[PDB]
Design a protein around this ligand. Sequence first.
Ligand SMILES: O=C(O)[C@H](Cc1ccccc1)Oc1ccc(CCc2ccccc2)cc1
Lengths: 270, 270
Amino acid sequence: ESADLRALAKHLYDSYIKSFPLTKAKARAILTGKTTDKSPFVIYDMNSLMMGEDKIKFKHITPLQEQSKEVAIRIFQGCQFRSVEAVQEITEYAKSIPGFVNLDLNDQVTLLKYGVHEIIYTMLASLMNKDGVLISEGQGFMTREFLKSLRKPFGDFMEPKFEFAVKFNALELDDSDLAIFIAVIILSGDRPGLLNVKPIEDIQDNLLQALELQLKLNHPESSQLFAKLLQKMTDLRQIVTEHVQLLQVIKKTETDMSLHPLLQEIYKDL
Amino acid sequence: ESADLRALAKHLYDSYIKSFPLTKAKARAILTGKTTDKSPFVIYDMNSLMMGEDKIKFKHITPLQEQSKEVAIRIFQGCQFRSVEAVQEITEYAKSIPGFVNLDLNDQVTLLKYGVHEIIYTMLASLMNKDGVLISEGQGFMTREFLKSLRKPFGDFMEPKFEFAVKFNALELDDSDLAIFIAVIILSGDRPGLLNVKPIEDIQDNLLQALELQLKLNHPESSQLFAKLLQKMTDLRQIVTEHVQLLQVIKKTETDMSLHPLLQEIYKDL
Ligand SMILES: O=C(O)[C@H](Cc1ccccc1)Oc1ccc(CCc2ccccc2)cc1
C-alpha cells in the first residue's frame, strides 16, 4: 500500500534529521545562498588557513607553519578525523532502518563496512558547489583553488569528488530524498561475505519501492529521476575504488612514527 | 527517561558482540565440560606444552627451549601479541561509545592510554576459573599452577590476576553487563593530562546511569551490585601498578626482550 511507503519515507527522513547535524537544506543556505547572518571564514590562501585556525573550532592541531608539520598532511589527516565522526552518525542511522537490527550481526557489520565510503561521498556533495566545500560544521569554507594547489599527491585528491558533486547535485534532491537513497545503499546485497542475502534484498526491495514514490511525488516534472539516481551508484563505486588507490599511494609517504601508535590505531581505513 | 538508557545498553552490548570474538558466554560454555562439542587441550607441564603446538594453532617453538628462547619467554611473547590485539579491539569498541569521537583528539588518546589495561584485566577474568585460563580463542587451557612455576620473575605476572578474577567472577556478571562497565572505565575524567573534563564527565555520567539500570533489571536480587562493581575499579588500578614495575624488571634482566611499540607508548612511569 502506498500509505505504507509514504510512512517509511517519513520515518527515515525523521531519523536522518536526528542523526545528521548539517543538512543539505541548511548547508545550501550558507553556500551561494544568501541567509547572511553568520558568514563562514573563507580559506583561500596559506595565510587564510594559518590566520584562521586558532579561531576555528576544529580538533587536530593549532596553526603552526615553519618547517614543522606540513599543511598538506594536516589537511588530509584532518579529513580522516571527521570521516570517523561521520561513521558513528551513519551506523546510528542504519540501526533506524526497519529490519536492519534483526539481521545476522555479522552481516550488519559487513553492510556497514562496505557502505560507509559510499555514504560519505554522497553527503559530501551536500556541502560542495563548483567553487568549494563547507568546513567545520559549516563554520568555514575552503575554496577549490587552494585545495588544487596542495602537495603533489594531495592536489588531485579532492578533484574527482568535486566532479562527482557537480553532476550529482544537478539532480537537485533534498534531504527527504537522500534519506531513502542512503538506506538503499546500505541494504545492498552484493557485498562480499554476506551469510543470508534473502532478508537483505527483501528490505532493499521495500526501500526501492519507497524511493520510487518519494521521487515521483516530490519531483513530478523530473521524469525517470529514479533511474538517473540509481545510475549514479556507478560513479560512486568508481569514486570509492579510485579513493582506496591514492590512499595506498599515500601509504608510501608517511608511515613508521613511534608517536602515532594509539592515534593511528583509531584511524585504520574506514 | 529510563527508556533511552535501556536503548543505550542495547547499543553497547551490540558493539561489544561485534568487537570481541571470545565473549564470556562462549568462554563459560567451554570451561564447563557439560558441552563437549569442542573441549580444550590442557597445559599443565612441559610434555602437554609440547603436545600443545600440535592441535592448537601455535607459530612458536615446540621442542626444547633452553637454547632457543626458554619456555617462559616463549609464553610471554605470545601473551604480548594478545595484548596489542586486545588494545586494537578495545580501541574499536571505544569509537562506538556515543560522544567519544567528538571529544578532543588529545584527550581521546589520554583516555585510551589509561583505560586499556584496566579493561584487559577485566575481560581476562571471563577466561579464568580457580584452576586456570583459556588460551588461543578457547582451544587451550593453561594451568594456574604451571604458570606460577615459571622462572623467578615471569612467574609473578599472572597470580595477582587470578586473585582478582576469582573474586570478580563471584559477581556473576554477564556480557551485557561488562559492556557498559567497560565503557564507564574509559570515559574517566580524573585521568592525568586531560585538557578538558566536563565534556568527558557528561558522557560517563550517562554511562553510569545505564549501568545502574542494567544491573537492577538484570540482577534484581543482587543488593548493591552497582556500588560493588565500582569498588572493583580500585582493584584494577593497583594491578596495573604492580604490573608496570614488574615490566620494568624484565626490561633490565633481559636486554634481548623487546616490549612492542604500541605497548611502550601506552606505558610510562610514576
Ligand atoms: O603488559 C601488557 O600489555 C601485557 C598485558 C596482558 C597480560 C596477560 C594477559 C593478557 C594481557 O602483559 C605483558 C607482560 C609481559 C610482557 C613481556 C613481553 C616479552 C616476553 C618475552 C620476551 C620478550 C617480550 C608483555 C606483556
